[PDB]
């Protein structure tokens, strides 16, 4: 019988294997609703005549 | 109104002189904002 929840051992002295890394995963959702979140929009100069 | 999930909000504001009913006249409604929500609404109520 053991505890399912344990704590990280993060210490600056450990090697790159045990070093803490922040992993933020980007989750995309697609439904019948319109897309309200998109990338940047680049523009150029306007020329006339 | 709801078109393919787009909520189209139309608005017009003008002063009138009205005893009761509706006045006789013609006016056009300008769009306010477009809400890309896309949820189904089968009923509505008025705020008190």
UniProtKB/Swiss-Prot annotation, chain A:
Changing residue 6 to N: Reduced host ACE2-binding affinity in vitro. Changing residue 3 to S: In strain: Lambda/C.37, Omicron/BQ.1.1, Omicron/XBB.1.5, Omicron/EG.5.1. It comes from the Viruses. Residues 32-49 are annotated as: Disordered. Attaches the virion to the cell membrane by interacting with host receptor, initiating the infection. The major receptor is host ACE2. When S2/S2' has been cleaved, binding to the receptor triggers direct fusion at the cell membrane. When S2/S2' has not been cleaved, binding to the receptor results in internalization of the virus by endocytosis using host TFRC and GRM2 and leading to fusion of the virion membrane with the host endosomal membrane. Alternatively, may use NRP1/NRP2 and integrin as entry receptors. Binds to host ACE2. RBD also interacts with the N-linked glycan on 'Asn-90' of ACE2. Cleavage of S generates a polybasic C-terminal sequence on S1 that binds to host Neuropilin-1 (NRP1) and Neuropilin-2 (NRP2) receptors. Interacts with host integrin alpha-5/beta-1 (ITGA5:ITGB1) and with ACE2 in complex with integrin alpha-5/beta-1 (ITGA5:ITGB1). May interact via cytoplasmic c-terminus with M protein. May interact (via N-terminus) with host bilirubin and biliverdin, thereby preventing antibody binding to the SARS-CoV-2 spike NTD via an allosteric mechanism. This is Spike protein S1.
């Amino acid at each position: 019988c053991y505890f399912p929840l344990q704590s990280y051992g993060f210490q600056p002295t450990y090697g790159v294997g045990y070093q803490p890394y922040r992993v933020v995963v980007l989750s995309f959702e697609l439904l019948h609703a319109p897309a309200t979140v998109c990338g940047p929009k680049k523009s150029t100069n306007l020329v006339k005549n | 109104k709801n078109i393919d999930g787009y909520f189209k909000i139309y608005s017009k504001h003008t002063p009138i002189n009205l005893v009761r009913g509706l006045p006789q006249g013609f006016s056009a409604l300008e769009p306010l904002v477009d809400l890309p929500i896309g949820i189904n609404i089968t009923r509505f109520q008025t705020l008190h």
